[model samples]
Target: ETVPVKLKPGMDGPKVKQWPLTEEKIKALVEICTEMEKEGKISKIGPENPYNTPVFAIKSTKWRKLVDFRELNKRTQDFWGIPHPAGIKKKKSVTVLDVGDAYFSVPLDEDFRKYTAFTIPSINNETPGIRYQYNVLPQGWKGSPAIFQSSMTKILEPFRKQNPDIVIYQYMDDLYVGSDLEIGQHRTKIEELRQHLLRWELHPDKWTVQPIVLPEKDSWTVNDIQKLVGKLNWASQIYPGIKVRQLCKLLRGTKALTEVIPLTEEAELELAENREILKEPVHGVYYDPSKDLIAEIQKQGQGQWTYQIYQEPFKNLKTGKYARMRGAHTNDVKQLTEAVQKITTESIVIWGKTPKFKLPIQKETWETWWTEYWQATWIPEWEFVNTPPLVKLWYQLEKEPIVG
Candidate 1:
């Protein structure tokens, strides 16, 4: 069937150009395209090539054909946001699977796929149909990535549930598989999983599922701490009482910024503990709710160090959500409680998409601390939200109500 290209009003027609492809490459293109044609994934069009998008061939280890859809990004969203590495946590090992021909495997709507149709370069003959359209999603459309990601996620949802212990998270075409089972059992379950996914045409890595290793570094330098915090954030989900930012407080005082201080003994010591807890799966903690730990910290809030605690459901209680940062050095378990505390209280320090709590600005300390430990984007948030300016002015009478 013929599909016409939609030209922008008063826009110049797309100029026809050809890539000098090797005979082998042209043959490969025909072979693959025709196979797709047979599968009804793609079809050729009439010789009238008026609605064509240009095709180019990449010759590397192998020849691959690509289409230029620069104009047709007319409609799209990039859905390939890599998930936070911390989300793909497994107690022991995890397997990553790369699905083959990922973009091409998704079925694009015929109505939309028609827009992807392109003409073969002219041989100057009336070959009835050379303008082919993809029935399945093509690689170059603007929305292809987000489209592919959503479809792939849906496709894997059932598999994710079937293998309850194995939490499969997809980023673009890569499938990260995390298992809750013990290590030995994890490997066995993963092996069976490899072929199971293969049967569905989504193949696992050729190198196969190798043993998962915790990325570690013995160095306690700034970069080391960065990487350590990155990896340790994953531990926050697994082990309680660990906060990388607080531990990093070792880099304090005058030259702390410029000096090459060895990691504080406490930071290194904390990591050794991280290594042990992360070695195996463990249970989460529930704060003894009755402990009035909230009351204790609340009392402290009346003084120099105020507190903001998260709601109960925010994180495993083992990883405290309420934080009472006495200073940068004060970020251990008791302080790491922000995530948990936010989930517990509906009240925030008021106004907008704010943090669970915002301590008074001490430019040298808190600002320096967040810039160093958190992302350089350099603002604070509660539960992943940035603090926003609010329109409301409260009873600014005396000492504020504390926990708002």
Candidate 2:
């Protein structure tokens, strides 16, 4: 089945002035395009097509072709919603699988193909300029992931429903399989998973079951930092326990893709900290429905408040300390309500508490007041909370109340 491209009303072709490419880059990308043409992913099109986008060649170990779809993406209506696999508990042994050329595997509708059209510049002594349009989904298109996920979900849903015991986490083309079965049983189930994918014309590209450590490097290009960050994020998603320090300095300092980032002391320390954390045992967040619900709410500023629901008897999984599960940062009470509703069907217990730290409160430090506040445990006393619960919100002022 093919995907339909929906464009906003009165949308026309993007008028783009592409960047000039080097002779070497042009030759390499030409070869790549020729290969794609043979695969029926892309084909020559007439210049009459109104739509066009700039194309660029990037080299990372090998030269790969990419499209700049920023202009087209702006006018495109795409699916913004995606699934969250974090809710699915991780099992004993974990395996990662990815679709090879995932976007290219999906065919784009015939009428919409012309809108993805692009031109390749001619070589001086070779062929003239030629226009080509992708028959399949191009890599840089904004709608690619949404379309791919929607398609794959339909194909994979049956398999998932049948295998109730097997834990499969899917975010678009990437599938992380979790199993507690013995080695032989695990292998058999993995085979079944593979065949399921093969049935849908989705080829499994990479499969990994073991821990992979990244290479040590002092300096990295902006491209390297981007890839590193992406990989770390993916790992963190797959297993929530992986601790990755904020690389704010490294990320904020870089501007261009090719720019060299000589690791600063701060950047080096950040990377080292992340590496150390990864070496620790892998763990996952398990949401137990039977557990009591704890909604820790905090006020950010005047007129802003947020909350998160966590399964109670909550303790730090790693540190074994009294700790609250981290949740989303927002001021929307509706969001908190919605999240609580999803976690359990039974009546929810919402607890409002001030954040333990007072750093954000002052431009200064505190000793006596801060220490007492940090250690002080304040519990909400909501007794008459009934249907359409009336929450009494109040605060005490530093100064005594005065009457007129």
List residue ranges in candidate 2 displaced over 4 A. Answer: 1-4, 20-25, 56-64, 88-97, 100-106, 122-128, 148-151, 158-195, 199-404
Error of 2 at 13 (Å): 3.9
In candidate 2, the residue pairs with backbone N, CA or C atoms under 3 Å apart (3 or more residues apart, or in different chains) clash, namely none
lDDT of each: 0.45, 0.52
RMSD to the native, candidate 2?
23.0
Write candidate 2's Cα lDDT for 85-180 as tens digits: 442333555555655357788788888888888877765637756689989887766567567776667877776787877656543234557667
| Top candidate, metric TM-score | 2
Q: Which tens-of-lDDT digit does each residue in 296-363 have in candidate 1? A: 12212222222333334222221111324556354533333332333222111111111233333333
TM-score of each: 0.35, 0.40
Clashes of each: 22, 0
**CA error at residue 8 for candidate 1, angstroms:** 13
The per-residue C-alpha lDDT of model 1 at residue 208 equals: 16
- Model 1 residue 117 CA deviation (Å) reads 2.7
